[PDB]
Design a protein around this ligand. Structure first.
Ligand SMILES: O=C(NS(=O)(=O)c1ccc(NC2CCOCC2)c([N+](=O)[O-])c1)c1ccc(N2CCN(CC3=C(c4ccc(Cl)cc4)CCOC3)CC2)cc1
Length: 143
């Protein structure tokens, strides 16, 4: 119906975060993916302390990742949604994927991509559509 699939925004974002570390191949039209990447890179520069704390406190394992993902996301959106919190959600998913590869649990990346897609589709999609859609995010933060 929308003409797009949020799974693609998730897959492209995770691919970019892994590629930045040399964890996935990338030699280095659509504007949403570039806008989101840039916003997330800036978010992690501004909130470097929160990023470093999140990157060392996760202690991810295959049985604990699901619960940790849900708990952090619930904390993130407890006071409501805005674009910055959506950018923070992608950055959090990125940290979970990078940590999963670091801990030799690369298959978890596919599960994290599914949980992010499901949360965007079921819990954030209404807010996004009510707030001008991805079009409004690009109008505010895009080139
Ligand atoms: O300002 C905000 N929102 S905004 O006004 O919508 C807005 C403004 C400007 C711009 N972009 C800028 C425009 C000017 O040029 C440069 C770009 C955009 N944007 O979308 O691009 C949107 C805003 C600020 C901070 C914020 N977080 C919330 C999360 N928290 C830590 C935390 C968790 C957490 C910890 C680590 C990691 Cl990796 C992830 C999550 C998980 C558990 O919970 C706590 C840290 C602070 C949320 C929203």
């Amino acid at each position: 119906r929308t003409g797009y699939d949020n799974r693609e925004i998730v897959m492209k974002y995770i691919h970019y975060k892994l590629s930045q570390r040399g964890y996935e191949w990338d030699a280095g039209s659509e504007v949403v993916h570039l806008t989101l990447r840039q916003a997330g890179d800036d978010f992690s520069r501004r909130y470097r302390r929160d990023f470093a704390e999140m990157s060392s406190q996760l202690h991810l394992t295959p049985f604990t990742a699901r619960g940790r993902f849900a708990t952090v996301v619930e904390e993130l959106f407890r006071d409501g949604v805005n674009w910055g919190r959506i950018v923070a959600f992608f950055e959090f998913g990125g940290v979970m994927c990078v940590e999963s590869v670091n801990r030799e649990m690369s298959p978890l990346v596919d599960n994290i991509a599914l949980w992010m897609t499901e949360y965007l589709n079921r819990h954030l999609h209404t807010w996004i559509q009510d707030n001008g859609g991805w079009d409004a995010f690009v109008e505010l933060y895009g080139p």
